[PDB]
């Protein structure tokens, strides 16, 4: 599973710097020991505050306020390739930001075989307007007159007596 964590932190204050700045991140992590490890990863590449200098101040979970409402998420990904160069924008349709990034990882694990550390997610925004959705298939599950038969049907205990209906 996944659990989105709000993380903020700073460095140790010195006499030269009495008040360090505070930096907020909204990232995803299956537990909290990897959040406060990924947090020092992003902040080291951007703010150059090393792990031997900074400290962690607050970790909290962000449960989705409306998990019962369908939504569509536009997903900004910086992907670290074998050449280490990919900015990616991808849309997913589901209910929860926790659930989207799981599907984001899964698709990204198939077509582009991305690992854990090979991905640094950049920004996640609940895209709302229908004219901004830039994908054909996501658009088609959003027309009022949608319909389809069931796919992947299959309706122990081997040796069935009669033929399955499969209808």
């Amino acid at each position: 599973a996944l659990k989105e964590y709000q993380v903020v932190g700073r460095k140790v204050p010195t006499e030269h710097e009495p008040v360090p700045k505070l930096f907020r991140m909204r990232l995803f992590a299956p537990n909290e020991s990897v959040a406060k490890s990924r947090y020092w990863y992003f902040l080291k590449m951007i703010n150059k505050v090393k792990k031997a200098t900074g400290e962690i101040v607050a970790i909290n979970e962000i449960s989705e306020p409306k998990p019962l409402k369908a939504k569509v998420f536009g997903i900004w990904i910086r992907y670290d390739s074998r050449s280490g160069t990919h900015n990616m924008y991808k849309e997913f349709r589901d209910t929860t930001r926790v659930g989207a990034v799981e599907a984001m990882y899964a698709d990204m694990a198939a077509r582009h075989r991305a690992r854990f550390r090979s991905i640094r997610i950049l920004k996640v925004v609940e895209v709302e307007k229908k004219e901004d959705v830039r994908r054909n298939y996501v658009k088609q599950l959003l027309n009022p007159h949608l319909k389809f038969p069931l796919p992947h049907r299959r309706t122990k205990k081997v040796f069935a007596p009669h033929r399955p209906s499969t209808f």
Binding site: Q6, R24, R26, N60, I62, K123
Partner: protein
């Protein structure tokens, strides 16, 4: 002496031999009631639901 290693978690006699407090624990004290108040600041909820 001490032929068997008795377990003071699963034996309820050696536990009282080692710990003379098992006659008063009250592990579950009702320190709250219906009147629990919400303590969620506005500026914390603003920095929570930011982005």
């Amino acid at each position: 002496a001490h032929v068997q290693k008795k377990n003071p978690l699963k034996n309820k006699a050696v536990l009282s031999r080692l710990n003379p407090y098992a006659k008063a624990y009250k592990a579950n004290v009702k320190i709250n009631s219906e009147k629990t108040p919400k303590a969620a600041g506005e500026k914390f909820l603003s920095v929570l639901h930011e982005n």
